[PDB]
Amino acid sequence: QVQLQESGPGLVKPSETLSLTCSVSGASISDHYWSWIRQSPGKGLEWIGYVYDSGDTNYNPSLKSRVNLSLDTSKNQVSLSLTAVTAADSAIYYCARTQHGRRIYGIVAFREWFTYFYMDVWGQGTPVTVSSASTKGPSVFPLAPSSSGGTAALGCLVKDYFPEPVTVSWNSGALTSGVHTFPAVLQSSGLYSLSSVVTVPSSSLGTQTYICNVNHKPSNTKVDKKVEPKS
Amino acid sequence: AITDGELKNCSFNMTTELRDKRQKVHALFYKLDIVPINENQNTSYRLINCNTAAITQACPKVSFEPIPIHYCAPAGFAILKCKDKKFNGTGPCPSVSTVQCTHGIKPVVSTQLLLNGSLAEEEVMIRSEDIRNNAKNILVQFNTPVQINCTRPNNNTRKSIRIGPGQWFYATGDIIGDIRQAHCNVSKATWNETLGKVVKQLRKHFGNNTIIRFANSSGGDLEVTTHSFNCGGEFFYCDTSGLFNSTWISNDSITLPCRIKQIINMWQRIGQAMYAPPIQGVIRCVSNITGLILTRDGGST
Amino acid sequence: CNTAAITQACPKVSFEPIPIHYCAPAGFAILKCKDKKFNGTGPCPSVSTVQCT
Amino acid sequence: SYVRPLSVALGETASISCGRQALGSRAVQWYQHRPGQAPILLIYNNQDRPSGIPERFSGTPDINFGTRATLTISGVEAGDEADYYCHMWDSRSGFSWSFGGATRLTVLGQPKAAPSVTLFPPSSEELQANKATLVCLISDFYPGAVTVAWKADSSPVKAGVETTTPSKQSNNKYAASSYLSLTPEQWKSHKSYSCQVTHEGSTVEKTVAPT
Ligand SMILES: *[C@@H]1O[C@H](CO)[C@@H](O[C@@H]2O[C@H](CO)[C@@H](O[C@@H]3O[C@H](CO[C@H]4O[C@H](CO[C@H]5O[C@H](CO)[C@@H](O)[C@H](O)[C@@H]5O[C@H]5O[C@H](CO)[C@@H](O)[C@H](O)[C@@H]5O)[C@@H](O)[C@H](O[C@H]5O[C@H](CO)[C@@H](O)[C@H](O)[C@@H]5O)[C@@H]4O)[C@@H](O)[C@H](O[C@H]4O[C@H](CO)[C@@H](O)[C@H](O)[C@@H]4O[C@H]4O[C@H](CO)[C@@H](O)[C@H](O)[C@@H]4O[C@H]4O[C@H](CO)[C@@H](O)[C@H](O)[C@@H]4O)[C@@H]3O)[C@H](O)[C@H]2NC(C)=O)[C@H](O)[C@H]1NC(C)=O
Ligand SMILES: *[C@@H]1O[C@H](CO)[C@@H](O[C@@H]2O[C@H](CO)[C@@H](O[C@@H]3O[C@H](CO[C@H]4O[C@H](CO[C@H]5O[C@H](CO)[C@@H](O)[C@H](O)[C@@H]5O)[C@@H](O)[C@H](O)[C@@H]4O)[C@@H](O)[C@H](O[C@H]4O[C@H](CO)[C@@H](O)[C@H](O)[C@@H]4O[C@H]4O[C@H](CO)[C@@H](O)[C@H](O)[C@@H]4O[C@H]4O[C@H](CO)[C@@H](O)[C@H](O)[C@@H]4O)[C@@H]3O)[C@H](O)[C@H]2NC(C)=O)[C@H](O)[C@H]1NC(C)=O
Ligand SMILES: *[C@@H]1O[C@H](CO)[C@@H](O[C@@H]2O[C@H](CO)[C@@H](O[C@@H]3O[C@H](CO)[C@@H](O)[C@H](O[C@H]4O[C@H](CO)[C@@H](O)[C@H](O)[C@@H]4O)[C@@H]3O)[C@H](O)[C@H]2NC(C)=O)[C@H](O)[C@H]1NC(C)=O
Ligand SMILES: *[C@@H]1O[C@H](CO)[C@@H](O[C@@H]2O[C@H](CO)[C@@H](O)[C@H](O)[C@H]2NC(C)=O)[C@H](O)[C@H]1NC(C)=O
Ligand SMILES: *[C@@H]1O[C@H](CO)[C@@H](O[C@@H]2O[C@H](CO)[C@@H](O)[C@H](O)[C@H]2NC(C)=O)[C@H](O)[C@H]1NC(C)=O
Ligand SMILES: *[C@@H]1O[C@H](CO)[C@@H](O[C@@H]2O[C@H](CO)[C@@H](O)[C@H](O)[C@H]2NC(C)=O)[C@H](O)[C@H]1NC(C)=O
Ligand SMILES: *[C@@H]1O[C@H](CO)[C@@H](O)[C@H](O)[C@H]1NC(C)=O
Ligand SMILES: *[C@@H]1O[C@H](CO)[C@@H](O)[C@H](O)[C@H]1NC(C)=O
Ligand SMILES: *[C@@H]1O[C@H](CO)[C@@H](O)[C@H](O)[C@H]1NC(C)=O
């Protein structure tokens, strides 16, 4: 029972110092390894570096010059720093618990053994987009139900914003059935737009006070909106 | 690749069947068979023998395994065999018999350690030409044989590259599988037991009680410093520091590092070197260590 | 050139076969079967002895 | 560099070869990666499967050299479809920083699912903001390949149309959405607006009109 949470900014200007944080809850940070992995669309996932428990570190030869790792003993937090970020450095960032492995193929005395690592427990991953563009708050407009029995459809609209992602809940997470949050779409304007609908019975419709809760961390804006039929 | 190399991957041009044509071939070599042609250093290497003597490739059909050979004397002569169990180096042999030919003597070429020999009967024998003189070596013969296992785990390959009309050169082919170095094993229980039986007979000539230590070879180089021998066609050179590393007064098998060469000059031969063609597959030979060859350090102790 | 080397036969030596007699050493002898109709093997009724063929 | 494709019939076992084959003794890790989600390793040491992994996945144990590290998946299903990476650690090669080239596993014979389309007219609050957007939502359709054509009455719009590429949801079906940006005056002028979604040979159309 180990859980990892990556808290990142989600947006950083190019040629700046990107930073993240890997909080751990399962066990102490001084008994296992901690490694960061980044996955960008169109490119295979990339192992950048692990973290000793003490906390020497090795880094991938490609990013060896621009990355610095660190582990906090007071707080089970694995911090990752990265300098001279560009548009390519944008990708989903993971931090996983790595375990030590020792493969023996010959006689131990004469070396003949290599260490092999494997990450058994992963975090959820926090996205990070690097671009000069500024932040933009999302416009939330309710989608009125269309009015056979007894299925009915309502939802909310999240107009142009930036950057990904956006979290959508209903009644502060009170309703989970029939909830479908579709992926956003990037318009030529450069801002994403996503929708989120809920399928509720005709009956219930009248009145249950359905409200969608929207949140956009980079914009620092948390918005709620009511949804009700319109004449 | 590897970070923090006994064998090396060598490329070089070699003549072909036709005089005008040449060919570039790559073949693996051992570090000992090669020296750098620069020392400044660059990294062009050459064979260790090219500077001193020519070289010839041992035919691949002939085998180097010693077989029992009987030395016979012509008619009118005879051979007298001393059947005295406790017979030392020289002296009067009370029990004598006559034979026309000797027993099956295997011509095992070894160093430091005697292999496949005949075991002394009754007690172990300590034979020398002058025990008082340190300069003369000391022959030891075991009554109980110790077992030694030498292997070359590398799954080498034979690359047959023609270098002329009819001439064929057999080069090493990239190794298949892990890269492990050759080594021999000896049971520590038996060797410690056999070594103790030796010190008992040693004290019979150096006082019933005295300090008897063992150290590694500190003189000479190459052949004299390593337990050299042949095994399946490959010439091994092992470090024996692990066996002669004790001090005597009043299943956990030992392991020995062994390096290999393919260019050799045996019996102090000056002028002709031999290239041992690579042996395909894994090599493993179990041999009997029946005798030893020791020497005192001397001094004013 | 692909299989084996090559050597040039000296020009003085001749390849013409000349009569050669195979002789046996003292203490041995050669038995010649003088049976006209003598086939491959079998008992030869008429036998003579010679030192060389 | 880029991914290599593999195709398997549904319910039939499949073998996934591993690129950059090992030179010596090896310990291989097989990772399962879904786009947007966290990678889950199936095999940490050739034949060792952490707790929770189903027994259907298996890998080849290097007992005698010459064997090729492969990933075997029995009872191939929708959830198996993904990208599989082969992390190689052999005795001859050094530190292996990079994972293997991705292997895109696709499951054939999956049952097609008709798309569920829901067209939403622009909200009154968007009209007060002097902007208008028609929102066409498509859910639970396989295979994830659709074309969206908008129409006005009869005429097609062909302008101001933005559509997401289909994405797989937890139902193992795809989901796509299309957005038509309009001016409030253009929304009131026409009688009705229609969203046409074509999936395989079928086509479903939904219509909405101003109040
Ligand atoms: C002369 O003298 C020399 C010196 O005395 C002598 O040197 C010896 O040479 C031989 C070869 O010549 C060497 O043999 C090899 O040894 C390897 C290691 O063996 C030991 O260690 C392993 C691993 O131990 C860890 O893991 C086990 C497994 O879970 C744990 O239980 C342990 O607690 C331990 O974990 C702790 O320690 C780790 C540090 O290592 C930590 O990281 C960890 O966190 C923990 O703290 C043990 O498994 C071994 O025990 C078993 O095997 C031995 C040896 O046979 C048996 O005696 C014993 O009864 C057990 O059955 C042992 O303790 C071997 O792994 C190796 O065999 C592997 O490699 C070969 C070739 O690469 C393969 O063909 C073979 O199949 C083996 O691979 C299997 O395992 C690997 C890794 O697990 C897999 O990746 C692979 O897919 C394969 O899986 C298959 O087998 C598995 C088990 O075998 C099985 O589970 C799978 O399901 C699958 O079927 C090889 O035997 C030896 O090391 C040298 N010794 C020394 C001291 O140097 C020389 O031989 C002498 N002879 C001469 C000169 O002729
Ligand atoms: C001190 O004394 C110790 C006690 O003897 C010594 O220990 C000896 O160590 C040597 C090695 O140094 C061993 O010799 C080698 O053993 C190899 C392993 O043997 C296995 O295979 C045997 C095959 O079985 C046959 O023979 C047995 C004999 O009784 C018989 O019962 C059986 O029915 C069958 O006919 C098996 O019996 C064993 O139990 C083992 O499992 C062996 O492979 C070696 O043979 C090689 O190499 C030698 C020398 O290089 C050649 O003379 C051989 O012809 C053979 O080479 C051919 O085969 C190779 C196989 O890979 C090829 O690579 C070669 O190229 C070659 O192939 C060519 O030639 C073939 C024949 O013409 C052709 O058919 C091919 O097409 C190719 O053209 C070798 O014998 C001793 O075995 C071992 N002793 C004992 C008792 O085991 C110790 O070495 C001594 N120490 C010192 C310092 O001297
Ligand atoms: C490696 O070393 C071991 C060390 O013992 C060695 O094993 C012994 O070999 C000898 C032969 O050299 C064996 O002795 C013979 O055994 C046979 C079969 O039992 C007997 O027929 C023989 O009897 C006679 O010959 C003796 C002289 O050898 C005479 O003393 C006697 O009067 C008989 O005429 C003979 O006893 C011996 O049995 C083995 N030891 C064991 C435990 O088996 C082994 O041969 C060595 N390996 C190699 C490759 O040389
Ligand atoms: C082997 O034993 C013989 C005994 O017969 C030794 O011969 C004697 O050796 C001593 C000194 O070691 C001399 O003083 C005697 O004169 C020798 N006697 C004869 C008849 O020669 C011989 O020295 C022993 N050899 C070894 C190496 O110990
Ligand atoms: C050494 O390597 C050779 C390969 O060159 C192995 O020979 C192969 O063995 C397999 C059996 O697993 C056969 O299927 C191949 O046909 C063989 N090929 C050749 C060219 O021989 C040999 O088994 C290896 N030996 C060891 C001890 O690892
Ligand atoms: C050298 O190798 C031989 C055989 O390869 C070993 O003899 C084996 O010893 C074990 C006990 O440890 C027995 O169980 C086997 O039956 C023996 N095999 C044979 C063929 O006799 C010997 O122990 C090895 N010696 C060392 C020092 O490693
Ligand atoms: C091999 O031969 C070619 C052509 O003769 C020559 O240009 C090259 O320098 C040679 N290389 C080596 C390493 O001898
Ligand atoms: C002998 O032993 C010494 C250790 O005292 C070691 O440094 C040296 O390399 C050894 N030399 C040989 C030839 O064994
Ligand atoms: C001799 O044995 C000692 C004690 O075990 C060990 O420290 C040392 O490395 C050995 N030296 C050699 C040359 O084997």
Numbering used by the authors:
A (entry chain H): 1 to 82, 82A, 82B, 82C, 83 to 100, 100A, 100B, 100C, ...
B (entry chain G): 137 to 140, 152 to 186, 186A, 187 to 309, 312 to 321, 321A, 322 to 397, 411 to 461
C (entry chain G): 196 to 248
D (entry chain L): 6 to 67, 67A, 67B, 67C, 68 to 95, 95A, 95B, 95C, ...
From the manuscript:
The envelope glycoprotein (Env) on the virion surface is the only relevant target for bNAbs and, hence, is the main focus for antibody-based vaccine strategies. The Env spike on HIV-1 virions is a metastable complex consisting of three gp120 and three gp41 subunits associated through noncovalent interactions. Soluble trimers of the SOSIP design that faithfully mimic the native spike have yielded valuable insights into the structural details of how Env functions and the bNAb epitopes it presents. Here, we describe an engineered trimer variant, BG505 SOSIP.v4.1-GT1 (gl-targeting trimer version 1), with improved capacity for binding gl-bNAbs that target the trimer-apex and the CD4bs epitopes.
The final outcome was that the BG505 SOSIP.664 construct was modified by nine substitutions in V2 (K169R, Y173H, S174A, R178K, V181I, Q183P, G188N, N189T, and E190S), a seven-residue deletion in V2, six sequence changes around the CD4bs (S199A, N276D, T278R, N386D, N462D, and T471S), and the E64K and A316W substitutions for stability. Here, we sought to investigate, at the atomic level, whether the 17 amino acid substitutions and seven-residue deletion in the GT1 trimer perturbed its structure compared with its SOSIP.664 prototype. Guided by the 3.0-Å crystal structure of the BG505 SOSIP.664-N137A trimer, we removed the PNGS at position 137 (via N137A) from the GT1 construct for crystallization. We were then able to determine the crystal structure of GT1 at 3.2 Å resolution. A structural alignment of the GT1 and prototype SOSIP.664 trimers showed a Cα root-mean-square deviation of 0.28 Å, indicating that the gl-targeting design changes did not substantially alter the native trimer conformation. Of note is the extensive electron density for W316, which was introduced to decrease V3 mobility and increase trimer stability. The side chain of W316 could possibly adopt more than one rotamer (which is difficult to define precisely at this resolution) but is clearly positioned between the side chains of R308 and Y318, providing a possible explanation for how it stabilizes the V3. A slight conformational change in the V1 tip might be attributed to the deletion of the N137 glycan, as previously observed. The N276D substitution also allows formation of a hydrogen bond (H-bond) with the antibody TyrL91, the T278R change creates an additional contact with SerL28, and G471S appears to have a stabilizing effect on the V5 loop by a facilitating a new intra-gp120 H-bond with Thr455.
